[PDB]
Amino acid sequence: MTEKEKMLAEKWYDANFDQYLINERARAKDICFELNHTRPSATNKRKELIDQLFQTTTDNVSISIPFDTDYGWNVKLGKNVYVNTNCYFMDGGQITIGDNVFIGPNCGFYTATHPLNFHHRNEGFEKAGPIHIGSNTWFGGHVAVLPGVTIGEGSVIGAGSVVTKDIPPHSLAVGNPCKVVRKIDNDL
Amino acid sequence: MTEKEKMLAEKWYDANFDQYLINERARAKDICFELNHTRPSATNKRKELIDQLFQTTTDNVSISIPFDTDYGWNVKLGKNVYVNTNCYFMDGGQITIGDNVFIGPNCGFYTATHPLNFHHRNEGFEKAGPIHIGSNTWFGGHVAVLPGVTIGEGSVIGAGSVVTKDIPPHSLAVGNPCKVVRKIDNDL
């Protein structure tokens, strides 16, 4: 297997020295840099850059600068996704975002695990754990979501939360660590 | 009532589709972009931009870039307010800051509430809850303050705090959620 293949298979992979991955990270970083230095009212140029970054034709994905991502093509986005300032989609592990998702400022979605043993870590190995963000969700600012975590559809995550475990659908959840407070009635 | 009027009255308002509000948000974003790309030693240009953003003549308001705000004119500032890097004043609900206030880096002051029910939220409605920051206050870095919260004069908020409830005057408070530790003797 190539290191990309290992990355996408939740296997340990040589994140630091593999050339294809190094190149892809460089591509995304330079696109982010361009985006981050594009005037917010330059609507068409921003759309172009975002679509280039995510390698897709987005539908009402609004990104408030600055923004960061590692690969870009490993963020799968629904329509009507509102990303406020200074978010980071660390997407070695796929980050899947549904439709109608409100992401507050300074949110970090982290899919990278490093080894606990520093000898292995120092060699550059990582393991990627995908993040699944359901449709119809709202994240407050300053939220961090950890590798492998799923946040169910219709759920609301309070500001400051550190989401270390899966959050069921239609739930209000807050805290560090993030814990369900109660259910949300999402009926029409 | 116009949507601005509803915003300022703590009523639900159509934050996403109202044209006056969309225009005002665009004005502030482009000013922030300019500010954020102005060399820190360009003292007069920065002062000009800050005063334009807040629509006021500031008195020793020091803003370390980057900085973000939604409207700018809905941040009311005292004199001698020191804002470190990467703060966000989300000011749909008025943010009132007193005199002699030290704001650490990566602090977010959030006045926006969205509906819990995703059907209402998805339609773009918000409700703004003003934030009142007393004079003679100090915030550590990485603090988030939630809608409707008042932090009393003379109080100190530890790094990392998530301030979900009002903090009385002359109090030392820390945590997520932020809780008073003890009183501060602020006598001369």
Add this chain to the structure above:
Amino acid sequence: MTEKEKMLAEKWYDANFDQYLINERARAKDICFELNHTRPSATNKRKELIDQLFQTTTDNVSISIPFDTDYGWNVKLGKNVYVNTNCYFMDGGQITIGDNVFIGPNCGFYTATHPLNFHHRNEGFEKAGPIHIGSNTWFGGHVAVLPGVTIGEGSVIGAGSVVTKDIPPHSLAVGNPCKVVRKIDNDL
């Protein structure tokens, strides 16, 4: 003693009005501004700027922009230090970082203490508490480290942690406040 000398001696010093310190802060800020607006693929220019900022010849210190520091020359770095996006090394008190250190995004290392009494604080006095980051360490994103804190070699700090007290070597630690979970076996 000069105010720099007091700063470096853990004494109260006039951080706000001393001219040498004001000048040094201005030097570092303008270097950071340049760095933060340099294309990430401009490898040689970035290396130049980083070495200028830290006043040293770095060895595989990788800084993902944006980055911020107060003095730069008061950050002592080992080799193979990986700093992800939007970190702040607030280095009035010396920040010493070992070899083989992985620093996640949105981490803040804060060495400044202000007086609790607002009358003293308002006069601009600060006290700097050095931070020591051991070799062979890994910090998740959104971590804040407070003044005077030491994180032992071989230790791992979970995302979102607020490190208010020293963390022993070879420890896994998480939380706000950050607490040791268990020991790490770091044997070959």
